[PDB]
Amino acid sequence: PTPKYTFTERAAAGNLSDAEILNSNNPTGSELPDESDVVVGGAGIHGLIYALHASKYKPNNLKISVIEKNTRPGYKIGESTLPIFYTWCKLHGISAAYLLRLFGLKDGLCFYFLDRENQGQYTDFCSVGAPGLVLASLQIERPMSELLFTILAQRNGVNVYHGREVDFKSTVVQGGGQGNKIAVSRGKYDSTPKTIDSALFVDATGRFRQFCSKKAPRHRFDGWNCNAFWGYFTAPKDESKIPFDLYEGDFTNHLCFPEGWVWVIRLPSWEGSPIANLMDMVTYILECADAGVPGDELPSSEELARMFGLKFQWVTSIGFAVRNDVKYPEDLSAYGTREAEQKFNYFVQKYELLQQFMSNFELIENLYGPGTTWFIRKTLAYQSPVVSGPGWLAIGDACGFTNPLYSPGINVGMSTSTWAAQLSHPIVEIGKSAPADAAESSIRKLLVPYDDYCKSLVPALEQMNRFNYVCYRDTRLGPQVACLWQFFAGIERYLSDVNIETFAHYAIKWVWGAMVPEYQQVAQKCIEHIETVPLDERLPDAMVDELLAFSNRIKSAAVAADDFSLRWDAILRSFDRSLNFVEGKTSRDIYTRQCSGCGAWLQLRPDWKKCHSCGLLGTEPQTAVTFDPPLTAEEEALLYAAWNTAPKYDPSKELKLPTPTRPA
Numbered sequence: 001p002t003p004k005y006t007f008t009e010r011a012a013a014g015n016l017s018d019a020e021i022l023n024s025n026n027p028t029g030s031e032l033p034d035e036s037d038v039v040v041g042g043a044g045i046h047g048l049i050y051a052l053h054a055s056k057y058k059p060n061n062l063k064i065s066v067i068e069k070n071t072r073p074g075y076k077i078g079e080s081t082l083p084i085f086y087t088w089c090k091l092h093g094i095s096a097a098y099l100l101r102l103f104g105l106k107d108g109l110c111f112y113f114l115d116r117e118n119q120g121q122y123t124d125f126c127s128v129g130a131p132g133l134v135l136a137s138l139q140i141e142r143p144m145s146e147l148l149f150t151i152l153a154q155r156n157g158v159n160v161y162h163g164r165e166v167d168f169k170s171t172v173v174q175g176g177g178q179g180n181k182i183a184v185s186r187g188k189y190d191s192t193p194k195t196i197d198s199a200l201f202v203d204a205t206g207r208f209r210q211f212c213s214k215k216a217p218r219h220r221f222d223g224w225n226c227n228a229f230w231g232y233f234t235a236p237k238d239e240s241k242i243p244f245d246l247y248e249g250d251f252t253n254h255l256c257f258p259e260g261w262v263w264v265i266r267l268p269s270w271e272g273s274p275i276a277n278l279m280d281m282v283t284y285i286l287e288c289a290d291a292g293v294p295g296d297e298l299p300s301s302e303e304l305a306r307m308f309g310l311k312f313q314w315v316t317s318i319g320f321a322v323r324n325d326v327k328y329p330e331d332l333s334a335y336g337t338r339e340a341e342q343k344f345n346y347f348v349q350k351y352e353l354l355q356q357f358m359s360n361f362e363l364i365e366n367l368y369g370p371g372t373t374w375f376i377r378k379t380l381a382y383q384s385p386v387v388s389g390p391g392w393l394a395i396g397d398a399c400g401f402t403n404p405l406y407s408p409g410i411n412v413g414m415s416t417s418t419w420a421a422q423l424s425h426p427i428v429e430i431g432k433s434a435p436a437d438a439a440e441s442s443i444r445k446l447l448v449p450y451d452d453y454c455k456s457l458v459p460a461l462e463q464m465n466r467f468n469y470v471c472y473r474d475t476r477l478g479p480q481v482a483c484l485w486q487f488f489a490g491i492e493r494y495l496s497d498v499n500i501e502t503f504a505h506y507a508i509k510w511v512w513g514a515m516v517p518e519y520q521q522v523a524q525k526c527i528e529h530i531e532t533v534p535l536d537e538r539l540p541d542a543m544v545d546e547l548l549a550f551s552n553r554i555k556s557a558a559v560a561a562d563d564f565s566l567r568w569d570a571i572l573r574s575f576d577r578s579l580n581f582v583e584g585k586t587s588r589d590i591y592t593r594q595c596s597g598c599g600a601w602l603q604l605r606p607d608w609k610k611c612h613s614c615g616l617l618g619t620e621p622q623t624a625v626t627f628d629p630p631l632t633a634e635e636e637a638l639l640y641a642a643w644n645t646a647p648k649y650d651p652s653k654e655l656k657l658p659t660p661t662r663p664a
C-alpha cells in the first residue's frame with residue numbers, strides 16, 4: 001500500500017486543533033450525535049477495549065460513542081502487558097509484526113530479590129515468553145496504544161470524541177428504556193453543553209470513579225497499602241554492565257526487597273510527534289495489517305518515523321512500588337526538591353545493587369511535558385462497592401485496583417471490560433423489547449454474576465499482591481514460593497483456543513490464578529506468619545524454613561494433579577520438569593536477540609531476517625530458536641501449528657479453563 005498523508009494534510013489545510021483532527025475520523029462526523037445506544041465515559045485503555053470488543057462481538061448492532069476529556073491520547077502509567085492481551089489484539093486483527101512497529105517486545109518476567117541485611121547478595125527468578133511463531137507480549141506507551149485503539153475503533157463503527165467531557169452534575173442516568181441523557185461539554189467553562197440520549201452508560205473514568213463514586217464510597221482494604229513514584233530514563237544499547245547476572249532488557253524486570261519492588265520496562269517512545277502525523281502512521285499500519293504485508297517487507301519503526309515525520313526514541317520506565325508503612329527520614333532535601341524525586345533517590349541509595357543498577361541509566365527530563373520528570377501516587381489499592389445499576393455499569397479501574405505487580409490493571413482488568421461489552425448487547429435489546437419494570441428486573445438479574453465477579457475480583461488480587469510482597473522480604477521465599485505459585489496457578493493454559501466468542505468467559509476464569517485454592521492456601525500461611533514480623537526486622541530463618549517446606553508439600557500434590565503438559569524446565573529457568581527448584585540450573589529456551597545496531601530486542605523466527613525497529617539486516621543463522629530441552633522437527637511444527645489461527649466458534653465446545661486441573 002502506498003502511504004497516505006490524509007490527516008497530516010487535512011490538519012494543515014484547516015489549521016485544525018489536535019482534538020479536531022482526531023474527531024474528524026469519526027464515522028458519524030466530528031460533532032456529537034443526538035443519540036447513541038451506549039455512551040462510554042473515558043477513552044482510556046478499558047473504555048476503548050470495551051468499545052472494540054462490543055462492536056467486534058456483534059457488529060452493526062450498537063451505536064457506541066466514547067467521550068474522552070483529553071484533547072489527545074494522554075500520558076498513563078501502566079505499560080506492561082501479557083499474553084492474554086496480545087491474544088485479544090490478534091483476535092482483533094493485529095498480529096505481532098505490526099504491533100512491534102509501535103511497541104516494545106516483552107519476552108517474559110524476571111525477578112531479582114535483594115538481600116537487605118547482606119547488601120550485594122541477590123537471587124533471581126526467570127520465566128520466558130514464547131517463540132516468534134507462537135505469540136509475543138508487549139510493552140506499550142499508553143498515548144500510542146490509545147491512539148491505535150481510537151483509530152481501530154473509528155474504522156469499526158465507533159465514534160471517539162477527544163477534548164470532550166462528561167458533566168456528571170447535569171448528566172441523568174436511568175433504567176427506563178432509553179432513559180439516559182448524557183451531558184457532554186468541552187469543560188466546566190462551556191456554556192453550550194450537548195446531550196446524548198442513550199440506553200446505557202459505561203463508567204470508564206479510571207481511578208477517578210466519576211460516576212460510580214456517586215453510588216458508593218470508595219472502599220479500602222485492611223492493613224498497609226502502597227505508594228508509587230517513578231520516572232523515565234535512557235535505554236542503554238549495552239546491557240552488560242548491569243549488576244545482575246543474565247540480565248535482559250526485554251523482560252519486565254522486578255527488583256524486589258523487603259519494602260517493595262522496582263519495575264524496569266524497556267519501551268519505544270513517540271513523544272514529540274504531531275498527532276495528525278501519528279494518525280497517518282497508525283492508519284498505514286492497519287492498511288498493511290489488512291493487506292497482510294509480511295514483516296520483512298513492512299517498514300521498520302525508524303523508517304516509519306522518517307516517512308511520517310515522527311519522533312522515535314528508546315526509553316526505560318523505572319519506578320518504585322513500596323509499602324506505606326515505610327519510615328522516611330524527616331528531611332530529604334539532599335535527594336531532590338520534589339517529593340517524588342526525593343523518595344525515588346532516597347530509596348535507590350538504600351540498596352547498593354539498586355544504585356549500581358541505576359548507574360547505567362540517565363534521567364530524562366519532562367518526557368511527557370512540563371512537570372513530568374517525576375510522578376508520585378499514594379494509596380494505590382481500592383474497590384468500588386457498586387459497579388452497575390439502572391442505566392449504567394463500570395469497567396476497568398473504575399471497579400477497583402491493587403498494584404502494578406504482575407500487571408492486573410490492563411491484563412486482568414480486561415476481563416470486566418470485555419464481559420461488559422458482551423453483556424451490552426442484551427442489555428440494550430432488553431430495554432427496547434419489554435416494558436420498563438420488567439426490563440429493569442431482567443437487566444438487574446443478568447448483571448448479578450457481573451457484580452459478584454467484581455466484588456470478589458479485587459480482594460483476590462489484593463491477597464495475591466500481599467502474598468508476593470511478604471515473600472519479597474526473603475531471598476528464598478520470593479522465587480521459590482511466591483513467584484513459583486503465581487506462574488503455576490496463573491499460566492494461561494489453553495489460550496490458543498480462545499476466540500472472540502469465548503474471550504470474556506476465558507478471561508474471567510483466569511485472574512492470574514489468584515482464585516486457585518492451593519494458591520490461596522499457601523498465600524494465607526505466609527501472610528499469616530510474615531505479617532507478624534515487623535518490617536524493619538529480618539524474617540527468622542526458621543520461619544522461612546517452615547514456609548518453604550509447607551509450600552513445597554502443597555505444591556507436589558497440586559502439580560501431579562495438573563493434566564496440562566508443559567516443558568516447565570524450559571519456561572522457568574530455575575526449575576525442572578516438575579516444579580522442583582534446582583540450585584545451579586541456568587538453562588531455558590531462547591526466543592529473542594538484541595539488535596547489534598539499535599539495541600532493540602527481536603523475535604527469533606525464520607521469516608524475519610531484519611530488525612523491525614531500525615531495519616538493519618542480521619545474519620541468517622541468528623534467527624534460530626534454542627529449545628532446551630530440545631524439540632524434534634515434528635514437535636516444533638506441531639507447536640507452531642496450534643498458534644497460527646484461532647479456531648472457529650463451536651457453541652457445543654466446552655471452554656477449557658486456564659487454571660490447573662482440580663485434584664479430584
Ligand SMILES: Cc1cc2nc3c(=O)[nH]c(=O)nc-3n(C[C@H](O)[C@H](O)[C@H](O)COP(=O)(O)OP(=O)(O)OC[C@H]3O[C@@H](n4cnc5c(N)ncnc54)[C@H](O)[C@@H]3O)c2cc1C
Pocket residue numbers: 041042043044045046047067068069070074076077078079080081164165166167168204205206207208210228319377380395396397398401403404407408409410411413
Ligand atoms: C504506578 C502504577 C504502575 C502500573 N503499572 C501497570 C502495568 O505495568 N501494567 C498494567 O497492566 N497496569 C498497570 N497499572 C494499572 C493501570 O495503570 C490501570 O489499570 C489502567 O491505566 C486503567 O485504565 P482505565 O481504562 O481503567 O482508566 P485510565 O487509563 O485511567 O483512563 C481514564 C480516562 O477517563 C478520562 N476521563 C475522566 N473523567 C472524564 C470525564 N468526566 N469525561 C470524559 N473523560 C473522562 C481520563 O481522561 C482518562 O483517559 C499501574 C498502575 C500504577 C498506579
Ligand SMILES: CC1(C)c2[nH]c3ccccc3c2C[C@@]23CN4CCC[C@]4(C[C@@H]12)C(=O)N3
Pocket residue numbers: 083108109127128129130131134135487490491492493495571
Ligand atoms: C502459555 C504461554 C502464552 C505462556 N504464558 C506465560 C505466562 C508466564 C510465563 C510464561 C508463559 C508462557 C510461555 C508459553 C508456554 N507454552 C504453551 C504452549 C506454547 C506456549 C505458550 C506460552 C509457549 O511457547 N510459551
Ligand SMILES: CC1(C)c2[nH]c3ccccc3c2C[C@@]23CN4CCC[C@]4(C[C@@H]12)C(=O)N3
Pocket residue numbers: 504505508651652653654655
Ligand atoms: C457455562 C455457561 C453456563 C456459562 N457460564 C458463564 C460464565 C460467564 C460468562 C458466560 C458463561 C456461560 C455461557 C455458556 C458457555 N457454555 C459453552 C458450552 C455450553 C455453555 C453453557 C454456558 C453455553 O452455551 N453458554
Ligand SMILES: [Cl-]
Pocket residue numbers: 080081109252405406407
Ligand atoms: Cl508483568
Ligand SMILES: [Zn+2]
Pocket residue numbers: 595596597598599600611612613614615616
Ligand atoms: Zn535494529
